[model samples]
Target: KEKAIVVFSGGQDSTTCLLWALKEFEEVETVTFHYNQRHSQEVEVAKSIAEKLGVKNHLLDMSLLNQLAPNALTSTFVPGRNLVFLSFASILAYQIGARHIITGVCEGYPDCRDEFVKSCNVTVNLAMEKPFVIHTPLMWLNKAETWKLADELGALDFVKNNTLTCYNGIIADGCGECPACHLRSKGYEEYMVMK
Candidate 1:
């Protein structure tokens, strides 16, 4: 019913969240950051996805952030990234007058623990003068369940084909030997079985 901002990354999860936001909100904008991560190529993919969805996109240059974050977080698996994504996203959300922020964070992801999401949700509001909503539509979903969401949202193929989910910055157009591929591949297999 209200306008919302999506912390999109042009990946399987964020793409699904962005699609979900499109149907749920009257106005939706995507905020994708470039922190010089290996998957920085996804910025172009994100732009393409946003354009296709007719979603207004805000690209933030966070190259400085890349320098500051230790190299460990650069791997396919990151821990507690929402601490940064949510904090910064909410800052932008306040400036844009968006009362809700959407993300594709799910329980299956290491950084997406329910307690962390809730704690960060509260922290973001307390950090700002106005309150905001952190919409984690996939917070309780496993990776396979999340695939079901992409399918139900009618954006599964688009996400699978257009966006990349590899941790090493390689697109998902093909499997990379990266750690991310194994995780997503297993989930896809399970999603197929469920269907």
Candidate 2:
């Protein structure tokens, strides 16, 4: 019933969360950050999806972070990513007068841990001097469960076709070579079997 901000990345998880937010909130907006990641195509996909959903997406340039801290991983993992994202998201929420912030972060990764998300929620409020609730709908769900969420949201096919979950920037099924592709493929297979 209130306004909410989603830290949308135009991926499978975030796209699902976007669909979830659309269902739950009266007004839902998104914020996408371009940190000079491996694929600039992600930003394009994010914008296109946002347009199709009629959601206003704020594209922020985080090229400086890329220039400053070099990622040791040969993949999409950026240093100090979640912390930076939440900091900016909180500020965006504050400016937009939205008390809710939605993220696709799950328990699959270290930064996506439930503890971290909760800590960020409290920290953001303390840092911004305002109450901003960070919502992680997928926090307790795995990839397979995430697929089920998309199905339940009636956007399974839409998310499958529109999201760019591949670390190599390939859309939909992705490259099938990267870890993200493997994980996503496995999850989909699991979901299908369960279905």
Candidate 3:
């Protein structure tokens, strides 16, 4: 099995990807980007989870992006953040000889779509001239299915209690008012009832 680099944010989706990487790859490493968002606690959770899972973690500073785009629309849509992050992840993977880079972005945002991911994959490979595989295991999964994936990976409780998915930097149930919290709450409820 080859090594993989996970673009982990310690959020529900990214953490699920990290767990998925741990299962699929022989070696897994994680990178968390700090873009000076409201929820800086996300980086903390990412570090904690990586440490707990014994995965090597790298924290990259992207404060310049934050400064450039002062008027970020929302917690979810940071405008070109994912593009910058994936480029950085590709560079990391290339340097580390990790041909696989995993991200947890799903179908919600434009950057998370299958077409966008595939386009990025091609660009990353062309830019680096290396055969890098960008994996999006959650691309087709909805929020509820993402929760189910984590549960199947035996990380449901850990993800629910440990990861920070709220826009307000709160963990677990979070503020429950923001968009992220609302989606997470509904997904958890749906998954619990279904399971």
Candidate 4:
């Protein structure tokens, strides 16, 4: 049980990933970003959940990033975020003597793709010229599978009851119309049936 760090955001996927990291690593720490987004409530939610779960949480001010990046695909989309998150996570990992870093971003967002993570690994490792592994256990998993993972970790109730999956920043209780809620509800439903 070595050390690991989670690039957490207090959302459904990230909360589940945090739990997974806690279980898999002897020592686990979390890093959450405050980028002055509409979903800023997630920062508090992230910290709360990490504290409740007894994980060491580190918050970073990354507000300048959102100001610089505007996603080209859509006006409503959040700025490209992973580049900065992963870069900072690599630096943190170096400082903490942790070789493994975990992130919750699965396959949905363009930046969360496997190729994106692989490229980050190449760049980060070359930049450090040492062993730094970015662990994306949720990389290939879909929302349903991710839910199943939380359940398997025996933290399904905790995650389902405490994590914020709503675009409106509602905890656990998602706002019905948001895509995040819709996806989470459908996935939970599927996972429940499978269980």
Candidate 5:
């Protein structure tokens, strides 16, 4: 059986990727990080989802990395840091014997600049000496398209109700003021209308 590791965050995109991995990989494992994000509740949500899926789950203590980055998600110094999380996830994947590391990052995410993903992938593969595949199933997708994929997977309700995308830490129906909540709400509205 093929094995894969998902950088699960229990957010919209990561949760979708988790379900996708369950279907594609014979054995799936999940690693969630506690990187001192304002919305740390997503870590708990990730644990719950992994438990429900009966997959092995690991929570890496990445609070130190958060100190280094000091970004919006991690710190107030630098706003909206995303790549650092991916880098941490990639390293974790190597340690866990996963050749493929799956994330929910999208191409259009402003902070997910092209060079960021490229650098992380290149560094992980070259450093690990293994064929490391960084899977971004939502790379080419928009938010509405992502929601549609979730609906197609029959996990839309679970996503809508269980996933935590709020930057303020509220799960499910999160604080609508955060950037994450705005994006999620807009995507859900558009997806429902389109479908």
Candidate 6:
């Protein structure tokens, strides 16, 4: 089996994707981007989870590019920038000899709209002849559905405790204010009620 690289962010979606990859792939590794986001804690969480899972984790230092596109994550001036991260992930996946690149990008997220994912996939494949397989396990699923999937995969506990989905950098039981926190909290609530 070929090696599969996960674009791990140490957040809810990525962590879920990581666990899913572990179930599907024989050899799984993770790559994280440190682009100077305001919440650097997520990266730390990613590292911790990878260690816990016994997966090889690689960090790409692309703070320089963050300078070019200042976004809420990497730059205080810009509010949000998810597309840039996807582009960077694509290039990093190619460099690391991964035929399949897994990401947790979801259509439910405001930043991860359908068009954006499609465009990214097209761009990533067009750039490489080997045709990088960009896997978005949560692409078609909503937040509630995502949580259910994690539970079905037996990774709900990991996602609940290890994944940091707070813009304020709070790990478990996040700040409950930012978009990440709200989304995660709502999803968890829905999942619990549904179960």
RMSD each, Å = 3.6, 3.1, 3.1, 3.0, 3.7, 3.6
lDDT of 4 by residue, 1-195 (tens): 788999988888888898998888899999888866535788888888898989788888886665554553334345457887899999998898888899977674778888989899889999998688899988889888998898899888998888888988788967878888888899889877887
Off by over 4 Å in 1: 36-39, 66-81, 108-111, 168-170
TM-score of each model, in listed order: 0.84, 0.90, 0.90, 0.89, 0.83, 0.83
TM-score of 2: 0.90
* Cα lDDT tens digits for candidate 5, 1-195: 477898887888889999888887888899887766535567777888778878898887766654555463433444345666776677777777777778887664665765667677887788768778788888888888888988888888988888878877688768898788888899889988986
| Local accuracy by lDDT, each model | 0.82, 0.89, 0.88, 0.84, 0.79, 0.80
Q: Could you give candidate 1's per-residue lDDT for residues 1-195 as a string of tens digits?
A: 888999998888898899899999998999998866534578888988899989788987765555445684553334455688888899999988899899987665656787887888888888886778899998888778888888998878887887778876567644557667777778888999988
Number of clashing pairs, model 1?
0
Q: lDDT score of model 3? A: 0.88
C-alpha lDDT of residue 159 in model 2: 93
Cα lDDT for residue 39, model 3? 54
Q: Rank the candidates by lDDT, best first.
A: 2, 3, 4, 1, 6, 5
TM-score of model number 5: 0.83
Best by lDDT: 2
Which prediction has more favorable TM-score, 3 or 6? 3
In model 6, which regions exceed 4 Å deviation?
A: 36-39, 69-83, 108-111
Mark the 10 consecutive residues where model 3 has the least summed lDDT.
Answer: 69-78
Native-structure RMSD, model 4: 3.0
State the weakest 10-residue window (summed lDDT) of model 5.
72-81
Least accurate stretch of 10 residues (summed lDDT) in model 2? 67-76
For model 6, state the Cα shift of residue 169 in Å. Answer: 2.3
